[PDB]
Design a protein around this ligand. Structure first.
Ligand code: SIO
Ligand code: SIO
Ligand code: NAG
Ligand code: NAG
Ligand code: NAG
Ligand code: NAG
Ligand code: NAG
Ligand code: NAG
Ligand code: NAG
Ligand code: NAG
Ligand code: NAG
Ligand code: NAG
Lengths: 362, 362
């Protein structure tokens, strides 16, 4: 008798973990009303209310960002966070705007998901400060009247005068138990031609370099609309330099330390949005693509009649997350299944485990 | 009764294609003795003797390179070429050496395979020349006593004097029937500090730029060992600029035009090596990784007792390629299968179609 796949995330072995926010945080005071997952699964998630893996990449606690030291391990992974950086946040650093930050948001989540698929542990870590330099200013945002905090990672600096400089930062091989066989490191820049400071238009740019690596940005065109853009990089542990072109420089202060597993396993991401009376985005949906990530989209609006509030407790997702209670045998875009011979609908890729074949073929 | 998967490439639907070299070229005079595939499958392959998709990316006919206008379409793809650029070629442009070109080789094949997995057609195309410029030299190799041809793509140029310049190149939306919804474009540079020309050490670097794109390289350190390194880029059709920092500039003269299909399907690559009395590399094996590419490695040496010569006709691969004669129902790392209920061994990912489950689970 053919089994119907249960739409939502699953796991085939005890060795899975989740990553999330308030909707998976049993430390939040509204528990279990604010959950979108089963309560006995909280210990499998690494989650903090108000945070997201995107925020935590860029900011420390402060100026409205709630940061979190995300850390977990699992062959199989369930990602359910992101909404805490949506257009609703109304953030911008220069003139990139919200849509500009949806662009950054996709870039990050795209890199994280694909890197995660070849990893078991993911650990946000603090990098040691670079070799000291002097006569410098930290970068600042003009966005939101100068109240928008430019990220703590990567850290921007501005030299009082044009200068020749290269500075050393370290991406470690390990962080307290975990192996960092690779790192997810942000490289952000401001585009749109030369950058105006005190009536002088300086060429904007700098680079990450080492003997086996290079990533850079440069511009000295006619000034126009400036955008704070981020690239997200896979960098191997080791010693790197950050080099200026004269006036500007960034160094990373944080990375996502990740190890490596030989068998690659698609991650799972569930849609993280707000109620309809708040601006959401489809970054997760755009970032979580085949074949490295399995996307479970919400068909309905965010509706929580039995939750703590209109944004915490959604019926749809609660139903999806029910699948993480059963030791499944197949994890697919169509959902999870137990070990069975036939299926009620075609299983498509990316999948893994042992999946039933479509009955109508037999 | 459980079926054993046939180790090697397969196809589930008539809509597959191959990409290859002499070992899949029915135009070569040694046919069918020099083939590694079934002869009636030649019409499915796009192949030229002595060529490879890596060579064709970088060179026109001449100076020992045999170029080919590779072009094919298929939901499912079988890649079997590469050996015509192995360490055996003894090529180098600067001091990167053979291993340096194995590095370039991995980069290309890695990008091609993953891009191909989201495409149906792959077409090598010629780009229109950039807006004219003057007082310039084409770049040249020092490697092999100045007899090594620096690639025709991307084209390097050197300005007689330090200059401000930006030049326009076009990545088209279509090429005679096919849609180029994306392009695979090479961006190559020479690293190792400032570049010595006529007793002056110039900063080496330049960039590709547009309003929605940037890729660059720069260096002005102490001169050391110079290496010609390539990055391989996914760029959308449109108008781009190539900008210099003063002395150097590259523009692309070719790209791989590719369209987009919504369902992503892992490609298949078979090991392309020489006989043991020739230096091969494992670029294909390194480039063809899960989950975007399925690798069929050779367990044996290249042995062709019934071929045209020690390098054309291999027994092992000939046996693998037998699987492309049957309309399979499952394509896996373990090989192809027909539609069956059970399998003699565990099917692992990346796979696609409808695959039998491991008997020992039942
Ligand atoms: C502090 O005032 C200024 C300055 O003259 O330095 C004015 C300057 O704004 C003007 C009037 O051009 C502003 N730059 C830009 C491009 O918006 C510029 C930057 O916002 C500020 O210097 C911080 O820059 C970076 C890189 O973080 O700040
Ligand atoms: C033609 O002679 C020279 C020159 O003085 O211009 C000598 C120069 O070699 C010496 C003696 O430093 C060579 N540069 C390098 C780094 O090897 C340099 C380059 O090989 C040549 O200019 C081509 O350069 C590029 C970018 O293709 O060529
Ligand atoms: C931020 O502060 C909260 C309490 O406000 C605390 O639980 C947490 O440790 C902090 N986050 C980080 C990343 O330090
Ligand atoms: C962001 O702005 C919109 C309208 O512009 C508003 O509805 C929303 O409450 C604002 N959000 C915050 C957190 O201030
Ligand atoms: C800039 O910020 C860094 C990191 O947050 C901090 O350690 C340093 O004190 C700041 N420097 C200046 C000059 O404000
Ligand atoms: C940068 O651009 C400005 C305006 O085009 C020019 O005057 C200045 O000399 C340039 N600087 C460099 C280093 O090219
Ligand atoms: C996900 O769901 C929403 C609402 O149905 C839809 O608007 C959006 O386009 C979907 N995105 C993806 C990537 O499936
Ligand atoms: C190179 O020349 C061969 C014959 O030597 C010819 O078949 C082919 O068209 C040429 N290749 C390209 C890419 O023009
Ligand atoms: C490349 O060099 C090796 C030995 O250095 C030699 O065996 C081989 O024949 C050379 N290949 C060519 C094509 O000249
Ligand atoms: C440089 O090479 C290009 C492309 O092969 C060619 O069209 C041009 O004539 C060459 N220019 C010079 C100055 O040698
Ligand atoms: C490049 O480096 C050399 C040697 O360090 C220096 O003399 C020269 O002025 C530099 N040029 C630029 C544009 O930084
Ligand atoms: C492929 O096969 C050769 C010979 O058995 C081996 O040396 C090589 O490491 C293999 N590489 C991969 C990626 O499987």
């Amino acid at each position: 008798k053919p089994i119907t796949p249960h739409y939502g995330p699953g796991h085939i072995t005890p060795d899975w973990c989740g990553f999330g926010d308030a909707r998976s945080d049993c430390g939040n005071k509204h528990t279990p009303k604010s959950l979108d997952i089963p309560q006995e699964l909280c210990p499998k998630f690494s989650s903090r209310t108000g945070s997201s893996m995107f925020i935590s990449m860029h900011w420390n606690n402060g100026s409205g960002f709630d940061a979190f030291d995300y850390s977990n391990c699992g062959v199989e992974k369930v990602f359910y966070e992101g909404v805490n950086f949506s257009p609703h946040r109304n953030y911008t650093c220069y003139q990139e705007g919200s849509s500009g930050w949806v662009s950054n948001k996709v870039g990050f989540y795209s890199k994280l998901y694909s890197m995660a698929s070849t990893s078991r542990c993911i650990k946000l870590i603090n990098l040691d400060p670079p070799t000291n330099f002097t006569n410098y200013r930290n970068g600042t945002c003009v966005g939101n009247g100068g109240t928008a905090k430019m990220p703590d990672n990567p850290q921007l600096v501005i030299f009082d005068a044009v200068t020749k400089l290269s500075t050393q930062f370290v991406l470690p091989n390990s962080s307290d138990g975990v192996s960092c066989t690779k790192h997810l490191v942000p490289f952000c820049y401001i585009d749109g031609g030369c950058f105006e400071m005190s009536g002088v238009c300086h060429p904007f740019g700098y680079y990450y370099e080492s003997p086996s690596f290079y990533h850079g940005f440069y511009t000295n065109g006619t000034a126009g609309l400036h955008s704070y853009i981020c690239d997200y990089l896979e960098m191997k542990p080791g010693v790197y330099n950050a080099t200026t072109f004269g006036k500007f420089l960034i160094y990373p202060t944080k990375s996502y330390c990740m190890d490596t597993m030989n068998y690659t396993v698609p991650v799972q991401a569930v849609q993280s949005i707000w109620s309809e009376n708040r601006q959401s985005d489809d970054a997760i949906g755009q970032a979580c693509k085949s074949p490295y990530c399995i996307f479970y989209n919400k068909t309905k609006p965010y509706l929580a009649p039995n939750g703590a509030d209109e944004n915490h407790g959604d019926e749809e997702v609660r139903q999806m997350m029910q699948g993480l209670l059963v030791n499944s045998s197949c994890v697919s875009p169509q959902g999870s299944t137990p070990l069975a011979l036939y299926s009620s609908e075609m299983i498509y890729i990316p999948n893994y485990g042992s999946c039933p074949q479509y009955y109508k073929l037999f």
